Amino acid sequence: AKWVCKICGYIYDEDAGDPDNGISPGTKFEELPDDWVCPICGAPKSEFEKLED
Ligand SMILES: [Fe+3]
């Protein structure tokens, strides 16, 4: 799945992960550590929304 940062528009793509910030490709959004933040704007996990209906 993909999740958008509601603040800045960064897309957390589970297939990409976020390796520069310690997250291997394939990591689901729920599994990101509680203190992971948007790598662009620093928003907390609460500010992301899943891109699905
Ligand atoms: Fe952001």
From Swiss-Prot:
Fe cation binds at C5, C8, C38, C41. CDD domains: rubredoxin. One of its GO terms (molecular function) is electron transfer activity. Keywords: Electron transport, Iron, Metal-binding, Transport. SUPFAM superfamilies: Rubredoxin-like. Gene3D superfamilies: 2.20.28.10. GO terms for biological process: alkane catabolic process. It comes from the Archaea. Residues 1-51 form the Rubredoxin-like domain. The keyword Cell division does not apply. Its cofactor is Fe(3+). Extremely thermostable, being unaffected after incubation for 24 hours at 95 degrees Celsius. Pfam families: Rubredoxin. The keyword Electron transport applies. Binds 1 Fe(3+) ion per subunit. Rubredoxin is a small nonheme, iron protein lacking acid-labile sulfide. Its single Fe, chelated to 4 Cys, functions as an electron acceptor and may also stabilize the conformation of the molecule. Belongs to the rubredoxin family. This is Rubredoxin. It comes from Pyrococcus furiosus (strain ATCC 43587 / DSM 3638 / JCM 8422 / Vc1).
